[PDB]
Amino acid sequence: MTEYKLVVVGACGVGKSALTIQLIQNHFVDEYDPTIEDSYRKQVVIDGETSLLDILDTAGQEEYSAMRDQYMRTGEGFLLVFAINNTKSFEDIHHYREQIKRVKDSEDVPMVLVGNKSDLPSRTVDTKQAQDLARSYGIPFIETSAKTRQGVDDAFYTLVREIRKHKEK
């Protein structure tokens, strides 16, 4: 069966765990321990293809090692998550993109920029700013809400379609 190794990255509190649980369980979590990093498998049909998604929700303390780089290198596609009400989380996207570039030795890694918490009225990051960054990286931008499920399937399925496009190259 076709397996896709997806990794959800971004700053603390942006909704990585909530997005992962909404995708896997169809449930919104108000609290998910920030020390729990784990991977979840889900079978899905995307464009007629039965796909096994293995989703790693990154967490814990910021720490680095050769072993951690070897592990992150196995990810096939990355969701770069920020929260639309947190400018710092948007500025932090650069760090996550550079760490993926560093470990993959490539400027062509499947990724999708995700602007989460789109249900909140307290926006500080304009959609145009996020589209401009995504255009600079050459990747799609998807607005999501783990709370209402807006854009969740689209964010993960678009990443899978980007991995397929990359594998065809």
Ligand X SMILES: CCC(=O)N1CCN(c2ncnc3cc(-c4c(C)ccc5[nH]ncc45)c(Cl)cc23)CC1
Ligand Y SMILES: Nc1nc2c(ncn2[C@@H]2O[C@H](COP(=O)(O)OP(=O)(O)O)[C@@H](O)[C@H]2O)c(=O)[nH]1
Q: Where on the chain is the footprint of ligand Y (CB under 6 A)?
A: 10, 12-18, 29-32, 34, 116-117, 119-120, 145-147
Q: Which of residues 98-127 bind ligand X (CB under 6 A)?
A: 99-100, 103
User: Cα separation of 140 and 142, whole Å?
Assistant: 7
Q: Among Mg ion, ligand X, ligand Y, none, what does residue 62 contact (CB within 5–8 Å per kind)? A: ligand X
For the bound state, the minimum distance from the C-beta of residue 32 to ligand X, rounded and expressed in Å, comes to 10
Instruction: Give, to the nearest 10 degrees, the angle between helix 152-168 and helix 16-25.
Output: 90
Q: Among ligand X, Mg ion, ligand Y, none, what does residue 119 contact (CB within 5–8 Å per kind)? A: ligand Y
User: Cα separation of 120 and 83, whole Å?
Assistant: 10
Rounded CA Rg of the chain = 15
Residues 6+ positions from 155 with CB-CB distance below 8 Å: 19, 79, 112, 114, 142, 144
Candidates 10-18, 61-69, 75-83, 141-149: pick the segment binding Mg ion (CB under 5 A).
10-18
Residues that bind Mg ion (CB under 5 A): 16-17, 59
